[PDB]
Symmetry: D2
Subunit: 494 residues, 4 copies
Amino acid sequence: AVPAPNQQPEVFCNQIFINNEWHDAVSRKTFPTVNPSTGEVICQVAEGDKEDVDKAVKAARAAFQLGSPWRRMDASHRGRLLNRLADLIERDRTYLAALETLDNGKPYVISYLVDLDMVLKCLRYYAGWADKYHGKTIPIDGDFFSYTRHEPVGVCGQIIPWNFPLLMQAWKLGPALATGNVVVMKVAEQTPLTALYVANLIKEAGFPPGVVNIVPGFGPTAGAAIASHEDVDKVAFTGSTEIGRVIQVAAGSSNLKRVTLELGGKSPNIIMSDADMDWAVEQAHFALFFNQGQCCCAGSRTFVQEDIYDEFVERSVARAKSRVVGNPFDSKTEQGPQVDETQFKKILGYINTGKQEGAKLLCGGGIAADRGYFIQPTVFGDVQDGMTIAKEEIFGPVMQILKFKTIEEVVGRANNSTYGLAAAVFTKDLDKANYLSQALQAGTVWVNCYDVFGAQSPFGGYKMSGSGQELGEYGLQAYTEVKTVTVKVPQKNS
Amino acid sequence: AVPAPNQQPEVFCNQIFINNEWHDAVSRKTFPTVNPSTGEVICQVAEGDKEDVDKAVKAARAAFQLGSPWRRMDASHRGRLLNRLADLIERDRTYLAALETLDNGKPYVISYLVDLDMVLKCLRYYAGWADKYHGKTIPIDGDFFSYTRHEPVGVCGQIIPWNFPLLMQAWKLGPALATGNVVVMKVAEQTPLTALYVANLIKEAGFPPGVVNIVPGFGPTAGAAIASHEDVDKVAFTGSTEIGRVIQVAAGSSNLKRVTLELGGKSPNIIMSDADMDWAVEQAHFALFFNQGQCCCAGSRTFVQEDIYDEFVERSVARAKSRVVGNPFDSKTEQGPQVDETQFKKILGYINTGKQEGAKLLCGGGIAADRGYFIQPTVFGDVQDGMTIAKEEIFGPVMQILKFKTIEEVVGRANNSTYGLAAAVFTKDLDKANYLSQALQAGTVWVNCYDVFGAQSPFGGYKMSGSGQELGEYGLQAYTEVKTVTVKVPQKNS
Amino acid sequence: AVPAPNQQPEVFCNQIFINNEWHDAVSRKTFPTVNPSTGEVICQVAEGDKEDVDKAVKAARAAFQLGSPWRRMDASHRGRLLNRLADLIERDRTYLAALETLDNGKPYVISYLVDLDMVLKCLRYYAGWADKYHGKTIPIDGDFFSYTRHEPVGVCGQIIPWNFPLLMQAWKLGPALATGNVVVMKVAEQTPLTALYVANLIKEAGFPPGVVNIVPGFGPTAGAAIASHEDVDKVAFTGSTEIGRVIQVAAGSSNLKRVTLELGGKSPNIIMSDADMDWAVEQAHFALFFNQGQCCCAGSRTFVQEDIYDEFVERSVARAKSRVVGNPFDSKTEQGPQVDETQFKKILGYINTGKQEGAKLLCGGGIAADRGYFIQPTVFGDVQDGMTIAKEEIFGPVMQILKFKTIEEVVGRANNSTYGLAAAVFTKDLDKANYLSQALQAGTVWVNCYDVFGAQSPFGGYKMSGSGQELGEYGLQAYTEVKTVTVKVPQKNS
Amino acid sequence: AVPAPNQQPEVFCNQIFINNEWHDAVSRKTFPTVNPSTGEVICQVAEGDKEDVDKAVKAARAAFQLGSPWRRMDASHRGRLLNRLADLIERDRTYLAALETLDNGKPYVISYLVDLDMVLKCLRYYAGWADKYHGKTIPIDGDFFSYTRHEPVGVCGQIIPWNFPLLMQAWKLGPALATGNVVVMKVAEQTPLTALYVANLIKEAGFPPGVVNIVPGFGPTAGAAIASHEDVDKVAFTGSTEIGRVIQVAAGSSNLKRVTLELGGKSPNIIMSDADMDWAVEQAHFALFFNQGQCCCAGSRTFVQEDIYDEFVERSVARAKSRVVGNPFDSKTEQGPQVDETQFKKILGYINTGKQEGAKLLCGGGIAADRGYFIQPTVFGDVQDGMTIAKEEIFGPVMQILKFKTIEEVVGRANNSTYGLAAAVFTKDLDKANYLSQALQAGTVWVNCYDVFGAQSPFGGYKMSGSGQELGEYGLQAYTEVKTVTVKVPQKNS
């Protein structure tokens, strides 16, 4: 039951957010944000750079000073604030879902029922962790009393992508604020509006000034500024596998700040011959096409056992062909446009490459509309491991279907990737499910499902898909600094 | 590769163990311990009573005094001692296995390869916990520093059964000693020898006097004294569902001491139609006949799906008939005699009870030898839910095979019991395995296996099979007391 | 900033609560609840008995059935409900505070700023645990996959006291509901009104029918019925050290249900000679006089070092004499009346006994008003360890001040008690604080403060003050049942 | 009671360790290792380079292959191995202590009683952790079963210093091996002998070939090879703050492998006016001069309150002057020589610099022997924050004593450093201890003691002293990779 959207919601926030106040860039510059559905400019936004980053960091550091309102604050209170911010977001749910769609391209139905529900659940989950992440009392040798304090890491620089603007923001603020850190966030140039509106809600929630600071702008400028700043204690980057390397270098050459990376992937979705055909087909479609195929963990390599390959493909193609593309605000729209022209062209290039390599184009394969960045649901069959489309993250509505015979075979081929973010297995057999979930080198392995993220389930990657984690109790580790206090006592006893 | 046994091992310890010294009963009385294989008296053993238990408790309390060797000792050291004890037990492994068999009746091969291996693994596992059970530093509201100390509960009375003499001893000593407690243990009147020998190794390992005190004798006397003692902080009993009630009453009427009970059960072993036949039959046999069927968690209710019922039974009977019964010291022997005359008769009564109710006697059902307490592997088919052999713990080599149709049906029938210790499921289907493992109300649920116990896996029960646990990190909770220290600080900060 | 109270609030709920519906006792009987400030009857209340309890239990068991709304419900959702219930309580805060005071006697200011604040903080804290109490994946030996599930214990019978009607209710419902259990709660005959009103809020919050059932009545009838019921899985009693024995007996004689007891105590408050005199005096006054001295962890044994004894006592007496007694609804009132006549008389008896034993009466010692159950703030000096007033829980506004010399002395005298609920140390020396905090045998030990309870800090007792705990992560262990599932796998790897 | 040493122990291992076999460098190259006590060459050692590192890594990856002995091995068994290795090290305790002293310079008495004792305690502590690092079963939303597996990170590159040869190796192998990883370790060119001998014991203990591979050589060559290798999953460096930047750069530019750094520091030891003078003086001496002042966490900034400054300094000077320097093999020797000539001269330079800046030289200040690298115990008084000796890690027997007035002042000055490894506070006041332990920005804060390291207590650093940790439960997080498996189930229930 989705409330009717305002297909052209007004933009109330388009500036830099520091100390709970809106500022223009020092350079007084801005940049336009495009509506991927029309190609039209939604509005202008403050273009932050080094100087603005510096303004943000100092404000954060100041809010993190020993004795500040944020530091003395009871941990249970931080939880109270997170729950408050969630209630505000829920109040403005219909608006945010709309604004998210207007700037990202994704279906308003998805933004409301999915994106925003997950935002709410994420913030409410972490609110609960605020006063529940205990330190330890250690039974060290000798007459001593030793314990640990889990203190905040400090000023945390967070750079987030555009595929899930509001959600990525929540996944980062949630653990950081629950553990007492301060944030200097850089949002994507493609989708900065929703994040900024939330910063307004952060102020209304009652968070002390400087606790959360958002700086919209470009990656080479603002992003690198944060990653290089001498006063930033930790930087968390989430995006392309290429930019991540830049960040780890700029961070290790600046002040040895802690660095966590969340990169892309070429996640394998294995369908064994005994899988529920109807279920497998529908999930494999969802596995890839979800969010215009713009998912870090997208099932971009659909491995199918030979005995059921033909039937699977036939059904897959039918599902692709029936997938409705169009205005994200229309309730019947399943797939919206791609985020921007760059990606739009980048995808078309991959499709072209797929054709060049001998991959059998089964459906779609070109522009889906003369206005906006829409691409038809494309499906490539008889894909080989050596093909480009079977190795490089496409990040679009392009499905690759590979055929395999043995289970021993598919494990090797699935694991034969520089990536290892996620993977999935569709089978009715107990042994096969356990065999594969253990053999697959992936941060997350789904059985008879895909893209099932719980605010309580960790999300990390193996190999070059990343390091460290988001969501779950493990998420608190990365934003926590451990101090050991060892006191000399008169005489220790058990 | 099992060493050749000394079929008539010498008995070196047969008295009361207090302050690392051997004492006779104050009454000077003694009782005989019989060799279930021959019906002959192995030797005489000190018959402890309330006065002796008082001696043991006082000794234990002294050893637990603030500032005593055992209280000041580093936690890591306790681990060192546990490991030492394990090394000594392994040194004398061949002997203990023989002595275990002599007094219990179980096959020497099983005592050596199973019983003793599990004792070693148990003690070594717990040795490792000694310095790793941390307390917590709590982020309490206000300007305070709050933390917790995990102190020992104190003088722990432990009453152990005869089905697994050495192992039960290890399961109790392991967690209690690892956490710094002291023990006054009452061993079974039928199998007291091995436990007392181990007490000798306890002194050799270097444990302070009074840390572990063992008192052989009877339950109505020694057992009750421990459970009733005003200075015992906790009592852990393991045995019949009838005596457990006595203990919880004697404990709640004495000094409100903490009480954990490990009782029996009528565990269900469900065999789905798609299960691996060969595997399921062999394991279903083992699930019940193991240790002369003398298992708290024995699979006394073998439910089989109708489509495979006939075949299953036919194979089950064949396996039963081939089961070699005889001298426990002969390598070929699979089943030895029952522990004592009382049980011997108790089982014959149940067998007769089965015949009276209309349960189909498929094999065995009578005495297996004119000397000792040997009983033929017995199997009853077409058993119904209302039958007594289908509700009461027989504790003997008597198998009940029941027939069922749907999965919804078997869950209700399996859960329809006052017991809930264990359960098992044999299937190839993933959904069936998960459905069942979640629906079955049992402390432990095995999938495509049975009687799989790891030193690291907890063992507890639902309903009237018990409360609290043995093994695993959970085992330490029961032997730990939590103290909260809340200090007032100048000014709190994250 | 306390809102003006309604000194005679209307009573809307005065019946039994089963399946979110109000019932009359089967016996149609009722009983009066008195206003301790005037001795007047507030209203009649349904008097539940065994038959009513049976109705409640069957309702509870029904709601706990596999597949029910409460069982299938997402853990995070139970959190949502707890938070919702919190919000409702906050809405009607001012009313409940008044009703609390009306039926209990405690000052309205305290009910508003303290009692209800804690009720809210408690429920909100626990709501956060709902989806954060993980099970474990165990690295068991052999080719197996072993894991644990933390399942609800089931039907939880909870019996709560009258000293903190609303708060005790939160402390019990919080952990129970967050872990998915169902409740059959018996409230105090002296203070049943507020609990019954909250039950209305439990319905409004959206909790499935039968998840929480409250049965007002008497302890010998209703209480014993719960404790003895054959279908109650666990019973948690909080009250006098005498009734607790009855409950553990009735429970161990019924169905071996799990039992946790929260009993009284004679908590020692140690004031070292180097303590901040002003602070210590005010905190020691608070430590005992709080809530009309009706605290299980009251500092009823004030030990003072000799060098500062005289000065301390003088100041203590002055503070006592200035302590305002009167109508609980007046801002200037610090101490209201005692809960009922029984206690009122029981306290005067102890006061008379104190004088008989030679304890020096320093102030007060008799009735504070000719109407109600008011007693003057009494202080006894030069109290000796052997005196009755220095051994038995008075549960009233009577202070005992003892003199001591050495720190070794006070530890021995402090630990020389059958109780061990709480203790406190006032000093400026690091070593003295640590020495005492470790040597004192009490569940909680406050340093330079007293009665500091956080919803996150555990509250348990040693010796005969209880077993098990409330609040903190430890509170969840008592309401959780652990199931181990061990799956056979093809081949295990690290 | 220390056993008499062999002042010239035979060297049995001086090559590269790969697949439990000794190899020569591919380049057939070697390099000399000096005895810092005489300046004489002990023996020649294989000089490993990139090609050698490649042989090691390939060996490691092979040993880590799914299905390998090391991967299938029971976690409890890895524990067994670690304990076995410790038993072998204890057997050859006397030898290794001598060999450590021979190549390092530290007193044999300290090598035996401290270094080797800590090696044993570390290995045994970790052996215990092998089968106790559980994953989690997560209560995710929806009809799913979600859990985590803590898998090894893979091929671990470890680069260790020379200050504590054996201990540094233990601190690295312990947590890595316990968690199932494989190691390619690079030992210090100054102290490679003991580490290589221990590798011989690793073979004897029974570890699979390739589980631990040691490659002696130079940092620029071997070290950089490891940090840069495309197949190394993680690199852990411990050394100078200069080389650490190089490693994090070479790693983020290679394959985004995980990096943990353990750098130096200028740790503050704060002595309040109420501190136990005798104790504080002796401990402050130990804090800095220990292990020839070669400690990452050395108390190089001794802050003393003015009221006790003069007396403190006097006593400190007297202790320094009495500190015996000489042959590390003579029982009376408290301080041996510095590790090598480079360090020897670097320290003299710092001593010179101290004099140039106006630091008051109170004793020593020059070479302590014409043979070897012995330096006199040096003490500088009236040091200011701005001075070089007050900011840069000297890593030698040079103490800096600073004077302060307020507690608020010392906090700011203590925290005014790029480092944040350790800190200490000597006081008798509770509030002062808590205030300072919380306010000080250091990984470790000792109260009334220094250099107290338990195998169970974590050791990490703030700011530029490092990231990640060694020792304790936290040590396992860095060597663990978390996989989330989320299975679709029929119907979820609590």
